[PDB]
Design a protein around this ligand. Structure first.
Ligand code: 3PE
Ligand code: PTY
Ligand code: PTY
Ligand code: PTY
Ligand code: PTY
Ligand code: PTY
Ligand code: PTY
Ligand code: PTY
Ligand code: PTY
Ligand code: CLR
Ligand code: CLR
Ligand code: CLR
Ligand code: CLR
Ligand code: NAG
Ligand code: NAG
Ligand code: NAG
Ligand code: NAG
Lengths: 344, 344, 344, 344
């Protein structure tokens, strides 16, 4: 049913499942824009495949050949199945557009599934090769931030009654290596390349004459060659090709809307904005240094992932509360922090 | 079965699922009127699609063409499938109303699913882009309110035997920025625009002549062109078009009933009523200031979400009990609060 | 449906299920490259089998024989089923390519399933015969590393206020025996051999004339032998053979892309890189000795499995944080370790 | 679908389910070679049955009879069903090979299921009659070994700062009785006998003429006896008999590969190797005596089950670590044990 496919592929959490494992607990490991680009680019061809053969849009078989009236039921079934299998054998069928449109019309679901798989591959490579590396580091950074917050408020609490910037040094180190960022821009670049190839294929397929689904087929190989009761050629038509073209144009539109999103995603430093650690600079136990910007290096990627997963950090939440209050400038940062009383 | 679709789409918790995650625990993050508008505007086209092809309302195929009596079974099947695929090819079919009604009749389920998806998109954008931002802030506000209540009753209990309005300052800050409110009114405005476009389309479709489902179809392209045994044209009829129109008028009625609800939702300040924090003004540890009204700013949105999710706050419940008792004015607020004894 | 098979075999965690048992908790026991090689080499033939008979690619029966027009419906059904069963009996059918292509065309799904099973067998033998042996040892090594880290920081903490390298001696012992490594390279070698045999078979099958699916069949054994109403021979065609060849070439391409991966996997010492225990050499309670390289011995296999599962080790994570910071060389290892304060 | 059966019967944990009960927690109670022999010998006939009627290998009905052209559709259906039911009634059908091949061709799935059930019976008898007896004893032995290890390290720890070999005496007692071992070799012997009978049957069935699936059938009992419009005899063919023979040869090959495995399993003392308790002899609280070898007695069976389930024993793991280190002979057993510090 149409509504079942709708639920399964947009309303269900299709490709939105969090990693079912206690190693990454609440950690996203895939940027929201990347998760939605993957969800679209993968589920849309699948949803379109499932629609192209919805039981109410499909009239029946995928091909019909119009055997003569003298032909029995089973002879007509043979003609249909023969021509269906004969869209490959170029000698049997004669089509005005060519044999390539026939191949594309028969194997359109396979090609869409191929595009879905190829578009799922880069997110899978990211989830397996580079997601744990960033997950461990991000979990460690969040733990260290919570610890420095607790120590700062404990020092402030003792005042109301070591000191090494380890996380800052770790991020300074991340500023050097660029392995994770080249992995990220490589998976994004393969996603963009596959999306553009899919756009090219879908634009070509939609550009077909729309009469290329009608091909002349001749069951005259083998012992049927010199047979006389069988006519020389049959007029076959590939049903559901109009549906294929109408769905291919939808896929092409969505994909050419998605390609600018991927291209923008490709520029990872430009997206690093609203410096997340700047809110921590108001802590005594934390050095006054953001030092996170301007590079095609893993530091910018970590900045993005921190900007995403930082809302889970309670210390960040309270510090941002104080920072927003500081916009008015009524009281003072350490006083409001001591008032806070939120170690964990 | 009809009853299965009924269960799935009204009696089941379709699109009423709470976010399956411990980040938002009992927090709604979608106003009840917005949740019901989404549920209706999305499930109604899906429920209608599923009804339009219920096994007891569908007689069989979606098209029937009445081949001549001389035609065999398979030749008639070819005529049916050809004309089904030929509602697209404008050269083959001749219809009094035009080819556009034929397109709309064949692809009515697809268009309804498209409307369902487009109507689901703004709630999805709200759930992903702006729901966590409001969720963290609302959870922090509820925690701070419980804390101030506990501190107030502890001070009162010590009397029977810091002091910074942090949440008030946070809300004062929210009064300034308007990012969340423009996100909210933007998703609501896109919902209204898509609902109005759906109303326009459904009113047009229902306005079709009701004989536009009968079209004359000619299987005479290719080698069949100069064939003589095949008649010049066939009288095809698109079954289940009357069902499509009867369901389109239902969808249009429900949508023109839903559009005023969305328009009213669009006026977020007007809906901010029954000042929820006013009940907290009777606490000594809480400054005597509501300061939440009159603006197209995120403060009004936070007021709505607080009015919704505030029933989960135990301190709010007890304070509202005292406030309602105060209507009689028998005793006194601090005495009844000390009697209360409900820290958590 | 195509999309259902897509989900089940690429988007679902097919053959990615962690061992459902508390004996191995978070331990991989299968290298990521080996897990992906198994997933591909097993799920691809299964996914291809499921595609070759997707309800929208299949026109109907797998064989059609074109009985004469005088034949009744049931007589034509008999001819179809007889020839289907007669691709085996070499006396009945006469084919230009031979009877072997006919056998291969009828039993192509069985042969692909056979290849899937044979390719699943070596990973199963590894999971049952050699996975627990390495699992117990790896869990013990991780526990001992956490213990030595805790003891080192406790000694450092006492300074701020036994001693036997047991794990080093255990690994030195592993350096001697080679049972696990010969088991590993044997399962990998059988995987490579079966992949190469599958490549050979698929390249042969795809090389078939593409007209070998058309065979002449004669229902003239038994009492039908001297019967006259039945014609001498029927022109049968095996539908879905073009689909079989198009899928066999896909399987062959993926398999010849997979074979270099298996060959590279076969060289286990070469893959032992980024010495994982080198990060532990900065501990006083740990002897300054890596001693893990250069051999076709179980030590290299344990090095690979440690490199994989070591991210679960918290002590390793903190030590790698200190080691990366040491790249700048600002402070000192023991001071930063004492600052660390992460016993568990 | 083929791939569904593949998953269910090889890739799923079919007949690999651990006993769903807290009485045996992590205890195997079935030797790995016995578990795999059972899995193969049971799932292979089931997987073959499911394949023999895969929807893409089955052309349709299991029998086709070729009624005359004058026969109506329902008369031909009657002939087919009559001959299908008439492979039993020996008077009606005349076959060159005999009626026994016809019986075997009709009831091949039943015979394979019968073999699967009979091969599942001995493992079931072992799981119910003799598995709890060995489970309680093995759990007690593991608990006693952990206890003696704890007591030995506690005595060693007190030195760094009763005494009855109960488990040794228990095993000495097991050395006497042979009930469990005769139960084990009896279930293995019945498994071997049933496997050999299945090999004999499958080798016979595969040896059929391959034209025994074509039998002449005569619907001429009752009032049809002297009827004239019905022909004297019909040429029926049992479709899917070639598939049955091709699958029977596969089953026979796998079974004659499995029979040597069962025969080797039958020699339980020979398999008792790598004396597991020898690693415990380095404990002071444990007497220096293995005393486990050379007998057709329950002690050898317990040795096998201990060798299997001993990896769950933590004390055994640590002791084996020390024993492997002792190969180099650098330090000393009690010193390294005291260093160990792994009571539980
Ligand atoms: C620079 C990054 C570029 C990013 C491109 C991403 C494009 C997407 C491609 C889709 C891939 C499918 C998804 C599967 C991803 C999982 C594979 C994986 O994680 O491979 C890791 C593996 C490492 O090899 P291994 O011996 O395990 O050594 C590492 C630890 N010691 O990797 C290997 O080294 C195995 C294969 C390489 C061997 C050489 C090949 C021929 C010789
Ligand atoms: C991915 C998209 C693939 C589409 C593009 C393929 C490139 C084809 C370019 C060469 C075309 C070619 O050989 O010419 C035709 C033959 O094509 C053929 O007969 C080749 C067939 C093309 C293969 C397409 C089949 C798709 C299969 C994918 C399934 C994947 C499954 C994944 C699970 C000749 O004919 P003509 O038209 O010139 O004749 C009229 C005279 N000019
Ligand atoms: C979006 C649609 C953008 C493209 C649609 C028009 C393209 C130009 C050709 C249209 C001609 C037409 O209507 O006749 C056939 C059907 O077209 C069509 O199918 C045109 C309407 C298609 C409806 C698509 C609805 C888009 C919804 C997106 C939501 C996300 C053309 O058929 P052809 O393409 O074979 O002729 C290729 C030759 N110019
Ligand atoms: C969304 C609602 C879309 C409906 C409105 C579409 C705008 C069409 C306006 C132009 C109409 C047009 O081109 O005129 C007809 C051709 O239409 C055509 O042949 C174009 C076909 C219109 C596309 C509708 C197909 C719906 C596909 C949506 C599927 C989405 C799937 C999502 C999962 C000519 O004919 P005539 O009537 O003038 O002839 C008698 C002489 N005047
Ligand atoms: C309340 C909504 C009522 C809508 C009815 C207004 C249209 C009246 C048109 C004539 C009445 C009739 O029976 O003829 C067909 C409409 O019937 C119908 O289709 C009327 C069926 C009423 C369905 C509404 C029942 C449930 C409403 C809400 C449920 C919750 C015409 O057919 P046509 O529209 O093709 O010809 C275009 C002609 N103007
Ligand atoms: C694995 C891949 C297996 C394919 C390779 C099999 C080796 C066959 C080599 C010998 C061929 C042979 O005997 O020659 C033909 C007979 O073949 C035959 O009739 C033998 C049939 C070959 C067996 C293939 C059936 C596959 C069954 C696998 C199912 C597994 C299920 C697992 C769950 C004669 O004919 P001709 O062509 O020479 O005649 C024209 C004159 N030269
Ligand atoms: C990249 C792999 C490309 C493989 C194609 C090489 C074979 C070329 C043979 C002629 C091309 C053609 O269209 O004719 C048929 C092959 O088409 C085909 O079957 C070509 C279809 C291409 C399928 C590959 C698309 C996806 C590849 C990987 C996806 C991930 C011949 O048919 P025949 O082989 O029976 O005659 C044996 C003749 N040499
Ligand atoms: C287990 C494997 C069983 C196969 C071996 C059965 C032994 C039969 C030996 C006697 C054969 C016999 O009586 O001779 C035929 C009658 O057989 C018959 O008509 C007896 C039928 C044999 C029974 C096989 C049916 C299998 C049922 C098992 C289902 C189990 C279900 C479990 C859930 C005569 O004929 P002829 O060939 O001599 O005529 C040509 C002249 N010589
Ligand atoms: C390896 C096992 C090979 C078994 C083959 C030995 C029998 C050879 C008989 C002639 C070969 C042939 O193609 O003819 C049919 C057997 O084919 C077949 O049935 C051969 C198909 C081979 C299937 C084995 C492939 C997978 C084996 C294990 C997979 C794991 C004869 O038919 P008939 O036996 O009725 O006539 C009785 C005649 N002696
Ligand atoms: C990502 C964006 C740019 C994609 C836009 C669609 C493009 C790729 C499509 C739309 C129209 C298409 C063209 C339409 C017709 C023809 C003529 C044919 O003989 C060769 C292919 C060719 C030349 C097509 C190539 C692909 C094409 C240019
Ligand atoms: C939200 C509310 C206002 C929706 C009410 C339904 C509206 C949009 C419907 C109801 C009747 C419809 C009209 C009925 C008939 C025609 C004539 C046709 O040649 C062009 C479209 C046109 C002019 C329709 C346009 C859409 C229409 C005005
Ligand atoms: C792993 C790589 C090398 C596999 C490449 C595919 C190989 C195995 C394929 C591709 C073309 C195939 C050949 C194509 C045609 C023939 C002629 C035939 O009468 C015998 C088999 C033979 C000779 C095939 C043998 C297998 C073959 C060589
Ligand atoms: C476990 C191993 C030894 C099994 C090997 C298969 C054996 C049991 C098979 C293979 C060939 C078979 C023989 C083939 C043909 C005949 C002739 C027939 O008139 C009586 C049965 C008899 C004599 C079969 C008996 C069983 C048989 C010997
Ligand atoms: C069919 O008859 C024609 C007559 O020209 C002949 O050329 C051809 O070889 C024949 N084919 C068969 C299958 O007999
Ligand atoms: C069909 O016959 C007509 C006769 O006028 C001719 O014009 C047309 O080209 C023919 N078409 C085919 C397919 O032969
Ligand atoms: C069929 O008739 C032919 C005539 O030559 C004869 O040789 C053969 O034995 C007959 N077969 C049967 C089944 O009667
Ligand atoms: C059928 O007719 C024959 C003629 O010989 C006779 O012997 C037989 O008894 C009849 N059977 C029935 C059912 O009338």
């Amino acid at each position: 049913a149409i509504a079942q496919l709708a639920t399964e592929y947009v309303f269900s959490d299709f490709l939105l499942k969090e990693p079912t494992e206690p190693k990454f607990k609440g950690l996203r490991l895939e940027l929201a824009v990347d998760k939605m680009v993957t969800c679209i680019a993968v589920g849309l061809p699948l949803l379109l495949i499932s629609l192209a053969f919805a039981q109410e849009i499909s009239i029946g078989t995928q091909i019909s050949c119009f055997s003569p009236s003298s032909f029995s039921w089973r002879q007509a079934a043979f003609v249909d199945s023969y021509c269906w299998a004969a869209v490959q054998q170029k000698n049997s069928l004669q089509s005005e557009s060519g044999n390539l449109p026939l191949w594309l019309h028969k194997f359109f679901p396979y090609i869409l599934l191929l595009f879905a798989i190829l578009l799922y591959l880069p997110p899978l490579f990211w989830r397996f090769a580079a997601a744990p590396h960033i997950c461990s580091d991000l979990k460690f950074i969040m733990e260290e931030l919570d610890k420095v917050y607790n120590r700062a408020i404990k020092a402030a609490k003792s005042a109301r009654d070591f000191k090494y910037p380890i996380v800052e040094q770790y991020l300074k180190t991340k500023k050097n290596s660029n392995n994770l960022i080249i992995k990220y821009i490589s998976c994004r670049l393969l996603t963009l390349i596959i999306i553009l190839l899919a756009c090219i294929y879908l634009g070509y397929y939609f550009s077909l004459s729309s009469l290329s689904d009608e091909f002349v087929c001749s069951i005259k190989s083998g012992i049927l060659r010199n047979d006389s009761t069988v006519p020389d050629q049959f007029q076959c038509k590939l049903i559901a090709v109009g549906i294929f073209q109408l769905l291919s144009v939808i896929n092409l539109v969505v994909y050419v809307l998605l390609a600018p999103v991927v291209v923008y995603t490709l520029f990872v430093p430009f997206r690093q904005k609203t410096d997340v650690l700047k809110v921590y600079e108001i802590l005594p136990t934390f050095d006054v240094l953001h030092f996170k910007s301007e590079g095609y290096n893993d530091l910018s990627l970590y900045n993005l992932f921190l900007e995403e997963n930082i809302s889970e950090v309670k210390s960040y939440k309270c510090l941002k509360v104080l920072e927003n209050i500081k916009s008015s400038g009524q009281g003072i940062d350490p006083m409001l922090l001591l008032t806070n009383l939120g170690m964990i």
